[PDB]
Subunit: 244 residues, 2 copies
């Protein structure tokens, strides 16, 4: 029970990483406000979890993000943890043919939603003098070639906004961090949404009170330690090239 009586708001909570995070935070003792556009699935999960409630929220619409934060405050009087999460990809294909409309629609969810979430959650938290704002980015936020163009730009932007927001909010007592799931392994076993949930709970816990502006990467080491490419150097009888 690492989040006993904490109040968490999780966006995109009706499926994937968002649902796994709502479940795990509830299991860890939090009061969870589930925000999503899937009303039927969102309500079903709210019924399943103890003391959770659902709030229809399209994170591309600032007023709805503000209203979700406000509803969390109306129900519980405080907000301890904000999770900016979306199970969404958006525009794909060649940069030569990506329309401005597809570009803007993608950034509206993947970037504006994070900005609105940080803005309005921070408004609630700076009054408390405490709080944790967490965004589900992606390894496409740390390097290219791992996702579509708009996806990769938005996710890099989310890491930049995470770091920038942390620099304003840290002296106010508020931490801002991101988790970067892989686009999924060198370890041979599949990455599950529950593991991303567990990374978010770690970051929200008091254990992580000095983890700030950090991007916690969960990708089996692909972005910094490609295991296939290493084999030509490592998977060999130990030897020495050159003069001893």
């Amino acid at each position: 029970e690492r989040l006993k009586d904490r109040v968490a708001l999780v966006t995109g909570a009706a499926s994937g990483i968002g649902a796994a995070t709502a479940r795990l935070m509830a299991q860890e003792g939090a009061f969870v406000v589930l925000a999503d556009v899937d009303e039927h699935a969102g309500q079903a999960l709210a019924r399943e979890l103890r003391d959770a409630t659902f709030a229809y929220t399209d994170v591309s619409v600032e007023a709805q993000v503000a209203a979700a934060v406000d509803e969390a405050l109306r129900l519980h009087g405080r907000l301890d943890c904000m999770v900016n999460n979306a199970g969404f990809v958006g525009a794909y294909g060649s940069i030569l043919e990506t329309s401005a409309a597809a570009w803007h629609a993608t950034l509206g969810v993947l970037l504006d939603g994070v900005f609105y979430g940080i803005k309005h959650a921070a408004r609630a938290m700076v009054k408390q003098g405490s709080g944790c704002i967490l965004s589900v980015a992606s390894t496409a936020g740390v390097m290219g070639g791992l996702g579509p163009h708009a996806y990769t730009s938005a996710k890099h932007a989310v890491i930049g906004l995470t770091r920038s927001a942390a620099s304003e909010l840290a002296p106010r007592g508020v931490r801002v961090n991101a988790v970067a799931p892989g686009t999924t392994s060198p370890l041979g076993t599949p990455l599950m949404p529950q593991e991303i949930a567990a990374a978010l709970v770690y970051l929200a816990s008091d254990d992580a009170r000095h983890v700030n502006a950090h991007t916690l990467v969960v990708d089996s080491g692909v972005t910094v330690a490609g295991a296939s490419g290493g084999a030509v150097f490592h998977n060999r009888p130990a030897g020495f090239m050159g003069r001893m």
Copy 2:
């Protein structure tokens, strides 16, 4: 054209590969070049080829020899403007389970200790001048794992850290410290012999997302850029020359971009 006119450069590993290409280009850009290497025949031959170049036998794993090469540059030319810590050297490879301490230490002696000695002694000459540029040839293996052997990768990461650390001391003294990170292939590392030149060109071709091979002259040009007055506010930087592999993926890893443009989601 002549971006290093009458500047004095000391280039280690100068008798071949990147070091030789750098010595040639810096001489062409008007610099007085001291060529440092343990290959006497190749080193002396290159010194005879280049105008105003001289050879100075230098094993960079031995601090005293690095210091003596700097002193030789000062004795001959009265100043040192640019130091290039370069080694055409790989060392230990294969499984970490059976990598000996001796192989570990031999590798780091060349690839890391040699850079420390070069920064230390070049900086001693340069802080007196109030100017100078210290450059180290690292590698993409200094920026991430999976691109070279274990000792190589650790040493090259350490070189980038020492580059940044030294820059934080030496910047207010007027001395810049930077690194270049060429891409490499295992063929260039492993393949030696009489056809080794073309094998490395082939390997570099298939490895580049741009489809063309990285040549030593291009790293020489990156180093000359960093030593030039154009780069006087480029400091502690790692200039990566790898066709984008470390930050945009290996060749063929992003064919999904060529799918017909579409939109998925709400």
